[PDB]
Amino acid sequence: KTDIEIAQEANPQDIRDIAKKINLSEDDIELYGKYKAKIDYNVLNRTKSRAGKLILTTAINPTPAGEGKTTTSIGVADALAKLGKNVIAALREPSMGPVFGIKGGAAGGGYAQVVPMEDINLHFTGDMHAIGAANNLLAAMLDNHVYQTNSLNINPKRITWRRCVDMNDRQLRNVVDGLGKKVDGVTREDGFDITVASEVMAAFCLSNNISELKENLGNIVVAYNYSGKPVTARDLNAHGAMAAILKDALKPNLVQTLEGTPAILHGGPFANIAHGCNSIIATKMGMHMADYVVTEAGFGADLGAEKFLDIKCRKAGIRPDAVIIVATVRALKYNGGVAKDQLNNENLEALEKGLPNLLKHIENITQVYKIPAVVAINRFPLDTDAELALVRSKCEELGVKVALSEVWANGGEGGIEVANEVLKLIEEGENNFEYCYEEDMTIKEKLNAIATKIYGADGVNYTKEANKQIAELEELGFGNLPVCVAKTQYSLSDDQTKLGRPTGFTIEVRQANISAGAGFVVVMTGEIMKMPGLPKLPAAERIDVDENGKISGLF
Amino acid sequence: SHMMEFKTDIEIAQEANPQDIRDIAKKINLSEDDIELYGKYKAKIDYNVLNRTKSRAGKLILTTAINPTPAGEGKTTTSIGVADALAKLGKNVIAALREPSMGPVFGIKGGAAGGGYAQVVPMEDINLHFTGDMHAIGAANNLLAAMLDNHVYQTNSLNINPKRITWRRCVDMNDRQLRNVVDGLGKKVDGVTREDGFDITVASEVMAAFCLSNNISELKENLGNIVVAYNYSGKPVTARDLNAHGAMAAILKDALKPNLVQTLEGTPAILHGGPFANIAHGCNSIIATKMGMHMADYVVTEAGFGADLGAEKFLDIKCRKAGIRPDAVIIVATVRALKYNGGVAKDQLNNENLEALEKGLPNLLKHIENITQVYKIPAVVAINRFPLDTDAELALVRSKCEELGVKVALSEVWANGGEGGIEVANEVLKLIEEGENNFEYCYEEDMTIKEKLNAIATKIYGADGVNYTKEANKQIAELEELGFGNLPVCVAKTQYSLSDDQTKLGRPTGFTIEVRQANISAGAGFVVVMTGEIMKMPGLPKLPAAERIDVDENGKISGLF
Ligand SMILES: Nc1ncnc2c1ncn2[C@@H]1O[C@H](COP(=O)(O)OP(=O)(O)OP(=O)(O)O)[C@@H](O)[C@H]1O
Ligand SMILES: Nc1ncnc2c1ncn2[C@@H]1O[C@H](COP(=O)(O)OP(=O)(O)OP(=O)(O)O)[C@@H](O)[C@H]1O
Ligand SMILES: [K+]
Ligand SMILES: [K+]
């Protein structure tokens, strides 16, 4: 059975019945049909919390296919519901753009999904459109100020703010606008990002309430003046209207899994130029309404988990009680020199040389951040017991239990082995959580702390332009913020070919930007694509609608 | 006529007690299985209800007005007032109106759906994202542009000439910066360099085809007929050639369901669509008007601008493609507007001027002759009364209008609400039950483009002929050779006058309209004709209204209106 067939034959409950499972009245939610609803964030102010625990699901350095990190979160959440616990699965919302290029995807996979799958891949509750409308209003007010008076003395060559659209349109990567008559604006270079790559999205996810959201949108640096000083959205008096555009969008979206477990999908920025987690207000909503929250971070534990802990948790004042490290025997054998085609041969030798990658993420989670961790093995069909005994053998050496996950084929029943081990880590495991770095350090000291402790590098090298940018950010006062390293996800290093666990390498930083709205410094290692393109035969050509309004060709 | 205890539109809207939308749905025999809730005050009506219920064959009431003036007319408030009035009279009625775009909200100000005590609520949501119809229009518009540029970049096997790409992107913002752009810059993997531009989302042809589709099947067909470019041979390239109309209809699947809201008095109100009244027809969607006529006994809808533009496009475009016929027409006018057509300045409009009232009255009399003697529809003049309107002024309008065989009913819906439109509504009930309807189109399909433009300019506008530029004569002929000569025409001229001249007020006579360009909207199904330059993308003022909008610690928005 395909993922689209499992979702259709599933019987989803009325979302008002899902809300009763977390003690939410019908005056506390706003329906979007029978199967979707938004939760008023003011419930956080008139009801007391349940002080729920936080479960973070990460994974080893990924292969182009994946390791089932999202299916593991949904399956473990369903498993904890099978154990009688009150649980919410906090996940990200996909973007609509890639649906029309490489076709859509299920919120999860197999029997560990989130439903309705069709609305999630499309407009959902309109959160993407709200993000893009606030992004494009600030850009329209920025160009309007330069056209009317430019009393802020903005240099058009130094405008870093970019418009956005929820489409895979390579045509809009590099743009000249403001052409035509003198009443048609100020001519300058510009461009479009995909909406999820916008800084509005990152500040949307790193806001604890509506008051902090408006303050963060005001801190957004949109350009620089001719004197070199930053110009903020607050200087343009735009953050008040931007917060109004995002007023309803900031309300988390309540949905359900295939087994009726309450699910919350909210936000979803990049995991390279941003932190790649769901919104703070959705995570803290789950911890307010449930006893256990299963969330995740994009890419491997060297990026998403590092940014979940050093950026999201630092701004939310929260802390994970357990970490689930997802790993597959295919990915470890892929790290052991095996190609994608030969991933099915029982190669115990290549599994051992790809294991240091899994063991490195185990050391980062358990010894650097000091959080109890458990290795969840996403059992792909052809795994052998000798393969599963070797990965269980060397994970015992550093004091981490290994549970076998079968949530893709069995749903919640397949995650009981992982669920129980997480519940025991919350009871047993001591928690001495420490950040990878402190705020007082400079930008270069924070990057060196991440590169040596987490990545395993000897140090960080900076180009001539990066040194100029880092120093200018220090002079402007942005040296007290966290740093967001944008590098490849397929490797611990910045070289996407160095698989396994690289040894004597150094990170080369070539560009640094400021995301003062989200509250971190973006540090780029290579070139990052913020607007993907459409393939030769886009999937949109196969999408159709019948006489009753049923969509075909989406999945 | 005047509000005894004056309140702004916000104070009236927030002091109002709106019913649950499921209780509004019960007033039109719609169960909770037929509606998708968007909160407790907004809902979407499944369009497959018309395939499961017997139609009530409701009556259609079009609300129009004289030419727009700087003094105001009140065509939107009159629509809500008459609908609330019919509800007070025991009638099962629905008000069908347009949805505003979010763009002008951050420019100058946000406006109530109406005003005074003739409003539609929830006001805050309608002016903002509402149920997301505008976003789906823009998504489908920009998807077509993305696949158009992708095809040209990948193979260009359709032989599209990049200089001849008419399709533009859109955004629901007032951003003059995006009027004229050049994109596709950078490396070879960054597309094909060409000139481009952005329209405001309500100006997209997708929006025009969105309102002129009877069902989702016609929508997919209309979107496929959209002409996006021309090849080097001169032949049109359509969205169907790009295999895009199926995906565009999927983006517009939920959006095609009309939105169900309510007035201040609990009357069911359907808001769906809202394009321009110059480059398009300026009406709410056909499926919304069909929905009301299927579920109600009377439907009150409106058309943008004066009767020379919106009512003409309602009858010659929308009514033609929907197969419906208006039973009664409401011509809304104010005494101060007719005195403005008489030569009185905007600051002297409050003085009683009986002679200037008769000099500007030929404007109202011209629209009456168009509704009653050209389309042959029973009409009624609804005077939006103001406190300073003397009895001599009101008696002069009633005298001159009753010569054409049309009654004049006073309207006080702004200050009194539903009971301020009883006189107008009962005058409309008399026209439907008594007067005969020999509805005729202004022209027919078989005529050439220049014959349809001549029939409109002479019968409706009062012109002696139509003059064409050299550039217009070729474009008309190119559309004739390509087989677009059997489509209605949508004249894009000024709204402030019956001519193409903004300053000739009242009733100009010895003039001629001057066509300067002619485009094709094969998706909506009409040929666009222009007498001047059109602003498809407004700009922000020096101090935009967005600087005043704020949100508090609890999520309450202020400064919006
Ligand atoms: N044990 C399994 N057997 C077979 N297929 C699986 C298994 N686990 C996951 N998958 C498939 O892999 C796909 C992607 O999984 P998932 O998205 O959870 O991984 P991910 O790491 O979150 O992906 P990404 O990192 O690309 O976001 C799903 O569609 C699912 O069907
Ligand atoms: N009789 C009246 N007295 C005072 N104010 C009125 C009256 N009628 C209408 N208005 C005001 O005029 C404003 C606009 O009226 P309305 O929208 O009905 O006019 P319109 O020109 O037909 O529509 P639009 O203004 O949207 O183009 C409303 O805000 C309303 O408050
Ligand atoms: K989405
Ligand atoms: K709107």
Side-chain angles (χ1 to χ4, degrees), chain A residues 1-3 5-348 350-400 402-541 543-555, chain B residues 1-4 6-53 55-108 110-346 348-426 428-433 435-561:
Chain A
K1 281 184 169 298
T2 66
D3 296 0
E5 301 167 309
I6 297 181
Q8 288 180 326
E9 67 189 31
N11 304 283
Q13 309 182 28
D14 195 305
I15 199 64
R16 287 168 297 184
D17 297 331
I18 300 295
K20 300 295 179 296
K21 300 181 178 182
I22 52 186
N23 288 333
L24 279 183
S25 175
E26 285 161 38
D27 290 358
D28 300 314
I29 61 178
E30 305 164 274
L31 270 62
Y32 283 70
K34 196 159 77 71
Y35 305 101
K36 306 189 301 289
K38 263 158 154 46
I39 305 179
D40 184 18
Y41 39 67
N42 288 327
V43 179
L44 303 172
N45 295 326
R46 60 176 178 267
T47 63
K48 287 193 172 64
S49 180
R50 295 184 58 89
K53 304 309 218 318
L54 187 55
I55 305 172
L56 175 61
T57 303
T58 183
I60 61 173
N61 272 111
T63 67
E67 270 77 82
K69 177 181 51 193
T70 305
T71 71
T72 302
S73 292
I74 302 168
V76 169
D78 293 327
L80 293 170
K82 293 283 183 53
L83 297 172
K85 305 274 190 164
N86 181 234
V87 186
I88 293 180
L91 303 169
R92 290 175 296 173
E93 178 194 347
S95 59
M96 192 175 183
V99 161
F100 298 112
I102 48 90
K103 235 176 173 171
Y111 282 92
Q113 296 184 27
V114 175
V115 156
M117 184 186 59
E118 191 190 80
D119 288 352
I120 290 177
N121 282 266
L122 295 186
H123 308 282
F124 199 15
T125 65
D127 286 352
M128 293 298 170
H129 305 305
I131 299 293
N135 188 99
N136 293 331
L137 174 60
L138 174 54
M141 296 179 60
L142 177 59
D143 282 310
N144 178 71
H145 171 85
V146 178
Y147 165 81
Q148 298 289 346
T149 70
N150 196 10
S151 45
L152 295 174
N153 295 295
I154 295 164
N155 184 13
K157 284 282 186 164
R158 292 261 270 164
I159 289 181
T160 62
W161 195 248
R162 294 165 65 87
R163 294 165 169 82
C164 69
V165 67
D166 208 356
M167 290 294 163
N168 290 11
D169 197 356
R170 73 174 60 82
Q171 189 75 8
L172 299 178
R173 289 174 181 161
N174 306 310
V175 174
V176 176
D177 48 47
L179 305 171
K181 321 155 202 59
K182 61 177 181 178
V183 305
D184 296 331
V186 182
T187 301
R188 72 172 178 93
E189 316 193 56
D190 194 7
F192 287 74
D193 309 324
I194 193 169
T195 300
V196 292
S198 169
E199 194 190 342
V200 178
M201 172 73 71
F204 179 87
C205 294
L206 295 174
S207 305
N208 294 265
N209 47 68
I210 188 65
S211 312
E212 181 170 327
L213 175 58
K214 186 179 64 179
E215 187 72 20
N216 288 338
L217 297 174
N219 295 335
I220 290 181
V221 173
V222 299
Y224 298 84
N225 58 35
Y226 291 96
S227 306
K229 303 312 213 69
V231 170
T232 68
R234 177 175 295 108
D235 304 333
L236 298 169
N237 298 329
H239 59 305
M242 290 175 65
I245 297 180
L246 303 169
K247 175 198 78 70
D248 288 327
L250 197 60
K251 305 175 180 178
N253 312 290
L254 178 63
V255 278
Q256 62 183 300
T257 67
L258 293 173
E259 302 174 10
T261 308
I264 295 183
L265 271 63
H266 201 227
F270 278 6
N272 42 34
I273 67 175
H275 57 293
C277 313
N278 59 264
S279 74
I280 280 180
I281 197 165
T283 293
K284 303 224 291 185
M285 177 83 64
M287 304 172 60
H288 199 98
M289 310 309 300
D291 304 325
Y292 299 89
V293 181
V294 186
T295 181
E296 67 170 6
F299 293 160
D302 54 325
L303 280 155
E306 184 272 315
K307 293 165 188 177
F308 184 94
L309 296 172
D310 294 319
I311 297 183
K312 177 179 177 181
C313 292
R314 195 190 304 265
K315 302 180 185 301
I318 62 178
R319 181 258 302 111
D321 295 292
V323 169
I324 299 179
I325 298 183
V326 181
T328 63
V329 176
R330 297 190 313 108
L332 294 172
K333 286 191 291 191
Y334 174 82
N335 286 263
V338 184
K340 283 205 310 170
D341 303 0
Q342 318 194 35
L343 289 177
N344 296 26
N345 193 81
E346 185 223 331
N347 193 323
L348 309 175
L351 187 67
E352 183 183 336
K353 285 183 60 180
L355 264 171
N357 185 261
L358 165 62
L359 260 65
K360 175 56 184 178
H361 293 295
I362 285 174
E363 299 172 30
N364 291 329
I365 297 300
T366 58
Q367 301 180 18
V368 180
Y369 301 107
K370 306 154 190 301
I371 307 176
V374 51
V375 176
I377 294 184
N378 206 65
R379 190 186 106 163
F380 273 76
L382 297 320
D383 294 328
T384 81
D385 293 13
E387 285 172 335
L388 305 190
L390 168 62
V391 56
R392 189 183 304 264
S393 171
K394 222 164 304 305
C395 287
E396 175 273 329
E397 194 197 296
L398 293 178
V400 183
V402 200
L404 189 74
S405 173
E406 303 149 281
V407 305
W408 181 79
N410 302 113
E413 295 294 325
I416 304 294
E417 191 182 337
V418 183
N420 279 324
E421 188 62 31
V422 171
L423 290 178
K424 307 313 165 298
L425 286 175
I426 298 179
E427 290 175 343
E428 211 158 326
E430 55 185 33
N431 207 355
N432 311 96
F433 171 72
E434 294 185 0
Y435 296 126
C436 188
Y437 54 91
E438 298 304 313
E439 310 256 57
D440 58 278
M441 309 171 68
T442 190
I443 301 179
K444 290 187 177 181
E445 282 170 354
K446 297 174 176 171
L447 296 173
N448 183 87
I450 300 183
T452 57
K453 296 184 182 182
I454 305 303
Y455 303 157
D458 307 329
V460 184
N461 286 332
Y462 305 92
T463 74
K464 187 193 309 178
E465 302 80 12
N467 281 327
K468 201 84 180 183
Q469 293 166 354
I470 294 290
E472 290 184 22
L473 293 180
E474 292 283 352
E475 189 225 291
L476 298 179
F478 299 115
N480 61 331
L481 300 175
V483 292
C484 177
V485 182
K487 73 172 187 62
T488 175
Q489 66 271 25
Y490 307 100
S491 173
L492 280 171
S493 65
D494 55 355
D495 199 359
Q496 53 179 333
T497 57
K498 301 178 182 296
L499 296 176
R501 182 173 175 177
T503 312
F505 64 95
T506 54
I507 299 294
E508 177 190 300
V509 169
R510 65 178 55 181
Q511 183 161 280
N513 312 92
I514 175 60
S515 296
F520 50 75
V521 173
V522 178
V523 170
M524 285 164 49
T525 306
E527 193 50 83
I528 304 298
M529 171 180 296
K530 294 141 64 177
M531 173 60 84
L534 287 176
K536 189 174 185 301
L537 181 75
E541 304 189 16
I543 300 179
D544 206 358
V545 183
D546 62 357
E547 52 197 357
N548 302 321
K550 187 70 215 70
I551 305 181
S552 54
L554 270 184
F555 315 94
Chain B
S1 179
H2 78 96
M3 202 172 300
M4 222 62 183
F6 175 79
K7 312 167 187 294
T8 59
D9 293 339
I10 283 190
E11 303 161 45
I12 298 178
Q14 58 179 329
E15 288 174 21
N17 293 276
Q19 307 178 205
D20 186 294
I21 198 60
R22 286 161 291 190
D23 295 332
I24 305 292
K26 287 149 49 192
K27 301 185 180 182
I28 52 182
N29 301 121
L30 281 180
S31 75
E32 291 165 26
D33 298 316
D34 305 328
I35 52 184
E36 295 180 356
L37 269 65
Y38 281 64
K40 53 176 303 177
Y41 304 113
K42 300 185 291 285
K44 249 153 165 43
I45 304 176
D46 188 6
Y47 37 57
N48 283 324
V49 170
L50 298 91
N51 302 337
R52 310 189 298 258
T53 50
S55 174
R56 302 185 63 92
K59 273 59 184 174
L60 187 59
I61 302 169
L62 169 61
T63 303
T64 182
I66 60 178
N67 294 85
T69 60
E73 303 88 79
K75 164 164 43 63
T76 302
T77 60
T78 303
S79 298
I80 295 144
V82 174
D84 284 337
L86 293 173
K88 294 256 189 61
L89 304 171
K91 304 299 184 174
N92 189 249
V93 64
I94 297 178
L97 306 169
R98 297 182 292 178
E99 176 192 354
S101 58
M102 210 173 67
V105 168
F106 304 103
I108 292 85
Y117 281 97
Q119 298 185 37
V120 185
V121 287
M123 174 184 54
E124 192 196 69
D125 302 318
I126 290 176
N127 280 268
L128 291 188
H129 308 281
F130 200 22
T131 64
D133 288 351
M134 220 61 57
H135 300 308
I137 292 294
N141 185 99
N142 293 334
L143 171 64
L144 180 52
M147 302 179 64
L148 173 60
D149 285 301
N150 180 68
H151 172 89
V152 171
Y153 163 75
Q154 294 292 348
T155 59
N156 195 24
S157 58
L158 286 162
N159 285 286
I160 293 166
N161 182 359
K163 233 77 188 302
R164 285 257 267 163
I165 291 181
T166 56
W167 193 251
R168 301 167 64 86
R169 289 170 170 82
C170 67
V171 64
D172 196 4
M173 282 291 159
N174 298 352
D175 199 357
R176 66 172 60 80
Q177 187 75 4
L178 302 180
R179 284 176 189 161
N180 304 118
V181 313
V182 170
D183 44 45
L185 298 173
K187 307 154 302 186
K188 51 185 295 186
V189 76
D190 293 341
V192 178
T193 303
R194 71 177 185 91
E195 303 191 54
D196 198 4
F198 288 71
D199 302 331
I200 194 171
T201 301
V202 292
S204 167
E205 189 191 350
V206 179
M207 170 63 74
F210 180 86
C211 300
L212 294 175
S213 296
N214 285 274
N215 46 70
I216 187 65
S217 304
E218 285 191 6
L219 178 60
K220 189 179 68 176
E221 174 180 68
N222 291 332
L223 296 175
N225 299 339
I226 287 181
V227 176
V228 303
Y230 295 92
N231 67 344
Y232 292 100
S233 304
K235 305 297 294 301
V237 181
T238 58
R240 180 178 292 101
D241 294 325
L242 296 170
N243 292 325
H245 53 295
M248 301 171 69
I251 297 180
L252 300 176
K253 175 197 79 70
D254 287 320
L256 198 60
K257 302 173 183 175
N259 312 286
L260 176 56
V261 284
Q262 70 192 282
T263 69
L264 298 172
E265 305 181 6
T267 315
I270 296 182
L271 268 60
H272 204 211
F276 279 1
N278 43 41
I279 59 174
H281 51 286
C283 309
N284 66 274
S285 78
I286 284 181
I287 185 159
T289 299
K290 287 288 193 61
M291 189 89 46
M293 296 173 57
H294 193 103
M295 246 75 68
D297 296 326
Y298 309 94
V299 182
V300 187
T301 187
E302 70 165 1
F305 299 159
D308 56 320
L309 287 173
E312 184 270 318
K313 296 161 188 177
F314 187 94
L315 297 165
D316 289 320
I317 305 176
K318 180 182 179 189
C319 282
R320 192 187 304 267
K321 301 182 181 298
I324 61 183
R325 162 190 54 100
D327 296 305
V329 169
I330 298 179
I331 308 179
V332 178
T334 58
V335 177
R336 296 185 298 102
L338 296 168
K339 288 158 58 179
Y340 170 81
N341 283 255
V344 176
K346 309 185 307 162
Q348 312 278 53
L349 295 177
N350 292 329
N351 303 312
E352 178 185 354
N353 200 322
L354 291 175
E355 195 204 49
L357 175 58
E358 194 194 306
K359 267 196 252 184
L361 257 175
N363 185 266
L364 169 59
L365 267 49
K366 175 58 183 176
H367 296 292
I368 298 173
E369 296 167 25
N370 295 332
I371 295 295
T372 57
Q373 300 180 11
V374 183
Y375 305 101
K376 306 179 181 60
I377 303 182
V380 52
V381 175
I383 293 297
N384 180 19
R385 194 187 198 182
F386 277 75
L388 304 184
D389 291 337
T390 66
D391 295 2
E393 291 175 325
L394 303 178
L396 181 56
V397 176
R398 176 171 294 180
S399 164
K400 306 282 266 189
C401 290
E402 208 152 42
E403 309 213 345
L404 299 175
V406 160
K407 306 278 186 58
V408 171
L410 297 181
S411 176
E412 304 177 15
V413 299
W414 176 84
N416 298 324
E419 52 206 32
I422 299 290
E423 178 175 326
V424 176
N426 274 328
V428 174
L429 288 178
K430 284 179 263 288
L431 298 161
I432 297 179
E433 298 175 6
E436 67 286 71
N437 194 329
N438 301 271
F439 173 60
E440 286 184 345
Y441 299 113
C442 186
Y443 55 86
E444 276 289 1
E445 225 67 76
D446 53 281
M447 307 170 69
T448 71
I449 295 183
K450 313 191 104 184
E451 286 175 340
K452 298 171 181 169
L453 293 181
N454 178 84
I456 295 186
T458 58
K459 297 181 179 179
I460 300 304
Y461 304 157
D464 282 314
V466 182
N467 287 336
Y468 306 82
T469 49
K470 170 191 54 54
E471 200 168 11
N473 279 318
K474 194 185 81 78
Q475 291 161 358
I476 296 290
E478 304 219 316
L479 301 170
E480 292 281 358
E481 294 183 348
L482 297 181
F484 297 114
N486 286 134
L487 302 188
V489 292
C490 168
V491 180
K493 73 176 189 62
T494 182
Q495 69 274 34
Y496 309 108
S497 178
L498 290 165
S499 58
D500 62 324
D501 187 8
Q502 180 188 352
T503 47
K504 294 196 288 203
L505 313 176
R507 185 176 183 173
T509 52
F511 65 92
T512 169
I513 80 171
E514 212 269 89
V515 170
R516 340 222 288 218
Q517 198 163 84
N519 306 7
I520 175 62
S521 292
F526 51 77
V527 169
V528 186
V529 173
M530 297 179 171
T531 65
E533 65 285 332
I534 293 298
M535 181 170 296
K536 291 195 169 198
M537 173 66 78
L540 289 173
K542 192 175 183 301
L543 187 69
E547 301 194 21
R548 295 157 252 170
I549 305 179
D550 201 3
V551 187
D552 64 357
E553 59 258 36
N554 301 320
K556 175 173 173 53
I557 298 177
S558 59
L560 195 57
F561 315 94

